[PDB]
Subunit: 104 residues, 10 copies
């Protein structure tokens, strides 16, 4: 969580990750965006990256994961707008989950 | 499947098979479902089995889309649902969209 | 014309064809695409293909074609909204034409 | 300028041309689109090709060109809306210019 | 600051620069964009290129960098709309930053 | 069949056509390339277009077509090497057929 | 097994199927290819489609699956060259398997 | 012609041009590409551009052009290997021509 | 390490990973292929995936990593041919390393 | 940098800047170096600094490639080296390859 006096309008951060599918205990690979308007504070990449690795080994639906991480983004830097998107692929099906908070 | 805090949107996408009524030929297609959850989440497996339900079935692309909307509405009643079907037949690319509800 | 008891919200059809350029009398390849909102009836793909094949050997500008084909789709399934897009390429020029009728009711 | 009965709603034309860069007198290669709402008339492709081609040998900024070609298309076929876009590259820089006139 | 009689509606310029990561002192690679509504004069490509080169060997975050460059464009040419986009990739994370100002 | 002085080393021609599928009497859309080493003669594009177009309405397998068009091109312009490739899609299946004659 | 008088030089057919992962009992999604030099007869698309559908709800590894299908093609049509390619994505890992036989 | 004290191993140049189709007398847009091995001298880009601009308004088949341009590059920098590739599009047909001379010594 | 009686001709496995750049202690994201002809045994994905995660937290050059993992592939399944490719990106530079063993 | 067991091949790639002699215009380019290590590895930073050496410098693309080959040969003497330079000038795409040695 990094200070900056003069703040930008929007920030997208995007990376890959790993969780577990609770139905069958298999590792699940996925992709995560986080889009946010800062006010004063700016999420650090190292931090965002730690936040994403928190789901290694852990059983969770991709729809939970997206919300879970939204709540964490608000924990650390509490911004008005935050969208989180989790793109994955399971059993021949491509999945995306957007979890949103605030207005554009 | 149920969530405490629902995500704002979900897109599922995959491939399936129907039969072309006119010609009784197998029709391969791709299909997306975009919905706003209210309480319930559609298990991926149940989505798959909805999509596999059309194997062997004679149906227009136009009807397949609409039939799948109903199904998804029935299974989890989202306030907004959009189903998209894409296929190719006799050199013609085909999309069909079936929406119900408010964004 | 194919009768459907539940009209889907939108349908796009898309395919290649050809015509003749009236200026130079050469064959003009194109993509065409019809996007429409059904009310009751659906355009059979076979009929759409027949509409597009109708332009083979026909002398006509692409701007004319988008509009000719629009009229056809109206006469056939009379939908409340129709958009025809023609895409082509002549003498180093990429060309798009769009023709529309009605609105998203 | 060829006269159709019913006008289409929208026409885009796109092609490549060249000009000279004022600063350095080297040739500039560019891509140019014109998008326009017809009224009675439609611009012949041959005529558009001649419009773009007239800039060969001519020293002009990408910015002035977008405007110059737009003024030509209004004068030729008088549409209620015209958008010209010029895309080019110069000394490691991707450049796009738009010039519009009238109502969407 | 090249004067033009008739301004275009919108200009985008895009290119690559470097700077330095504060945390780790590592040379940072990035893609950068300025979209702006010119008022009276356009930004010379050469000038813009200079602006972006100016950050070579400088300690700045991708979030601050975007903001600074927005300031510079407003000085140089004074447009009523300016958007700056920065794109990068640090430590397995893709990063975008947008910095806006005014109405379109 | 147009006669050049010095022959090129290699010509590819590629276009779209249609046929009927024997099994089901529906139309098959395909992409077809012919690659050939010229000797004195070069196949006119108009003549090639007519070759591909003659299959409209004709029931034939993609496989037999590749061969049939190859026999036509040898008969028209008699190259020491010809490769025809036919690409198509049918009931969820991507299909490619090659038919070659002679020496690379 | 469709007979043809003059065989083509090479045929590729490509499509999607499913099977089941042994370890985890999860429905496995995959892309599959057969390239073959036909001798006397070609494989009907329909037949091939059948071959690949045959694995729905079967316990097999992506490595065995490739091999089995190679066997089947050799039975059905008996070509002197056959290559089968399988492609997948299990648990964040992209997987290709090739299974050859004979000379080209 | 630009003299170079150390010849690189290969150079490709690639650009767009136009010509005229002798059949229909329309303008034909194309990509062209020259690949060569220098021995001593390098083709200036400005001269390459001049060679390609030489075909504007000129009636000529693309097969003829690949070969015409090949001869030019030979006359200019006389390299031990040259490959000219022309790419074009006429009446729904994608076209490639290749012309070669010499080998990888 | 999985048995299969009848073995395939080739297998590519490809995934992403994380190591450390020893020069500056920053996490390094990368991509890894492994291409191999099996004999009898077949590397399991779970295993390959564990082998790739072994480099989390660890300081190593990308040129070491590729060789290191080659040696590990031979540890577990000892095949004639093995290629390993590691694509990464550091300080504005795109890097690939192929580490090979045996013949094609 | 030195390796015990050398990798069989290495590709480095990045962007740089020179000056066009004819026109004194800045020339942006992309450049790859593919080499077979023998003992020594080229540090990425040293590669970068080789590529940055051409800023401000008037040089043909043809010569830049060849100059960079020499440099790489000098720094680490690989038995096979291939340098590739790509640029755009007056509407013409340019590649130059400079190889030395055996694959
Ligand atoms: C595994 N992660 C998994 C299995 N089935 C799922 N269904 C839905 N809807 N979301 C998931 O994350 C699922
Ligand atoms: C076969 N699926 C088929 C054949 N003709 C069709 N026409 C329309 N409109 N829709 C289809 O799904 C068709
Ligand atoms: C040939 N198709 C042709 C030639 N010139 C044209 N100009 C316009 N505007 N539209 C066309 O279809 C043209
Ligand atoms: C040459 N065309 C050139 C050189 N520098 C330029 N800067 C701007 N803004 N526009 C141009 O067209 C330029
Ligand atoms: C390095 N430039 C760097 C390292 N971590 C960063 N985090 C954020 N938020 N922004 C940066 O520019 C960073
Ligand atoms: C129709 N063209 C058709 C249907 N099934 C086919 N199988 C094969 N091998 N080839 C074809 O051209 C086929
Ligand atoms: C599931 N199908 C699965 C899980 N792990 C695998 N490992 C290998 N080598 N092959 C597979 O098909 C695997
Ligand atoms: C016009 N460029 C033209 C028309 N027909 C052609 N046929 C062949 N073979 N080559 C051409 O350049 C042609
Ligand atoms: C960091 N991992 C790093 C820094 N510099 C490097 N140079 C080379 N050649 N390889 C690496 O993996 C490097
Ligand atoms: C500028 N970099 C420039 C101008 N003309 C050139 N010609 C050749 N052959 N190579 C270059 O790098 C050139
Ligand atoms: Na443009
Ligand atoms: Na083809």
């Amino acid at each position: 969580m990094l200070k900056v006096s003069k703040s930008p309008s929007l920030v997208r951060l995007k990376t890959r990750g790993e969780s577990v599918c609770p139905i069958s205990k298999t590792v699940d690979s996925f992709e995560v965006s986080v889009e946010y308007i800062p006010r004063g504070a700016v999420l650090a990449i190292e931090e965002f990256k730690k936040m994403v690795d928190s789901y290694r080994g852990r059983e969770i639906l991709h729809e939970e994961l997206a919300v879970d991480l939204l709540e964490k983004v608000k924990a650390a830097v509490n911004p008005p707008y935050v969208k989180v998107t989790v793109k994955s692929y399971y059993i021949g099906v491509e999945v995306e989950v957007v979890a949103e908070s605030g207005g554009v």
